[PDB]
């Protein structure tokens, strides 16, 4: 696509996501950007055979049906296909009930490993709200 810097934080804010369960904005704006650099059309099939789909790369051997993860569950009850939208929100709900799960944004290999504990505001910064 894919998508800006504060055309996201922006799309990620309405969606009521800016201090979901603590996490600031600047997290999934962080975290965005190293899972998939942006991209809604992001995939990456993992080890086990499942595959990793959209801008927050949600997987699919839990969150997520694509039919070709077989022993999973599709928790989102909600198609992989649907994640690689332009549209945000599939991802964004999916993405919500993923930090409530009870291990919060750690779920993201990617922002615990580039983000957490971290100065994450920089990334929206100079954004218009």
């Known amino acids: 696509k894919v998508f800006g810097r504060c055309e996201l934080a922006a799309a ?11 996490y600031s904005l600047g997290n999934w704006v962080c975290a965005a950007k190293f899972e998939s650099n942006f991209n809604t059309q ?5 080890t086990d055979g499942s595959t990793d789909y959209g ?51 750690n779920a993201w290999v990617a922002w615990r490993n580039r983000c957490k504990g971290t100065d ?5 910064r100079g954004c218009r709200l």
Do not use: E, F
């Not at 990620?12 to 603590?22: C, E, I, Q, V």
């Open 120 to 124: 994450v505001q920089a990334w929206i």
């Open 12 to 22: 990620m804010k309405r969606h009521g996501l800016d201090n979901y369960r603590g």
């Open 55 to 105: 801008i927050l790369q949600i997987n699919s051997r839990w969150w997520c049906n694509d039919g070709r993860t077989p022993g999973s569950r599709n928790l989102c009850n909600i198609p992989c296909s649907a994640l690689l939208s332009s549209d945000i929100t599939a991802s964004v709900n999916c993405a919500k009930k993923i930090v409530s799960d009870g291990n919060g944004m």
């Open 42 to 46: 992001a995939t990456n099939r993992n």
